[PDB]
Amino acid sequence: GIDIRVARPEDAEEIQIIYAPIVLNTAISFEEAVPSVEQMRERISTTLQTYPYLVAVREGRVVGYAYASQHRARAAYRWAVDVTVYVAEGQRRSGIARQLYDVLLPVLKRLGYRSAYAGIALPNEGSVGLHERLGFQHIGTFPQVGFKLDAWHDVGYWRFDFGDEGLHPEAPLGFL
Amino acid sequence: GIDIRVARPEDAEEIQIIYAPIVLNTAISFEEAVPSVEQMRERISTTLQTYPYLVAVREGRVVGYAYASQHRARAAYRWAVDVTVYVAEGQRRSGIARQLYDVLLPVLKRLGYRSAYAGIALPNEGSVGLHERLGFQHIGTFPQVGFKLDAWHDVGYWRFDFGDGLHPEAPLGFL
């Protein structure tokens, strides 16, 4: 049925299992080392101190997650946000990914952010099309910018526009 | 006479005087408050312990400078570097900018870097010229991504290529 909720440091194990083959076997993440539960736990709670972090469950088991993160480091940038959506290594397609974004994106819009950015490791025709369907506009590509698993990978960036005027500080997310 | 050399923490004073207007009056940097000299001093040292940091002197005074910094945090981004060049306002469109690069790019090449990116705030004909007329390729723009001095600013990224085994990158000497 794929129900959706805010993640908590308890799901850290299940998330860390979704992440393992993504790090070890793919170029979706550029992390070259699988993180531990102890630090996976930390990331969840550290994210939730400012950004949302969502989990998808099926039959009482996490089969995908999605989170928001800082785009760049200075204050002039605090209305851009980086969105990350991962799904299980078996059944999701897109799929669970679109259900995740359809919750995550609105929250973001309602928090005060102006543009959401997603970086895809090309080639990725599937994820590419999903973002375009959602209404992400392709804004550029950093070619050969990353070397993981004995290969150079082009990384394209898609932008989601929220729309606004006047300006005022983006707002956080509800506690645990 | 335009002598180019590696920077030293003594340069912090004349570097602040160049950077500050940029901070105050432009979107060239998105930093909004001016760092102290003692702060600038630390950035020079901290940069130099891995990346090249250069300065351009003329008649004894610094009139420009340049550095490189990490592009993105993770390991796979090891071979990518960002490049940054600032000249004094009274030397805009004088040539120090390009001369600064001609030292800097080769250094990066022989350090083992694969590509170099410069982020340009975008109402800048002068800057885009220098980069494109230096072999940089425009690879994309991040529209209205940043807000400073009561205005949203577009930011476009230009890329310089070196060539292509994949052995890890290498640092810079102290003194």
Numbering used by the authors:
A (entry chain A): 4 to 179
B (entry chain B): 4 to 167, 169 to 179
Question: Could you pull the original sentences from the published paper?
Answer:
Here we show that ArsN1 acetylates both AST and PPT but with higher affinity for AST, indicating that ArsN1 is an AST-selective N-acetyltransferase. The overall conformation is a three-layer α/β sandwich fold, a typical GCN5-related N-acetyltransferase fold. PpArsN1 forms an asymmetric homodimer in solution, as shown by the extensive interactions of the subunits and size-exclusion chromatography, similar to related N-acetyltransferases.
To elucidate the mechanism of PpArsN1 resistance and its selectivity for AST, we solved the structure of apo- and substrate-bound PpArsN1. Arg75a in Chain A of the apo-structure also shows two conformations. The side chain of Arg77b in Chain B also appears to cover and move away from the substrate-binding site, allowing substrate access to the active site. The two conformations of this residue in L-PPT-bound PpArsN1, for both PPT-1 and PPT-2, are quite similar to those in L-AST-bound PpArsN1. Arg75 and Arg77 from each subunit appear to form gates that controls substrate access to both catalytic sites.
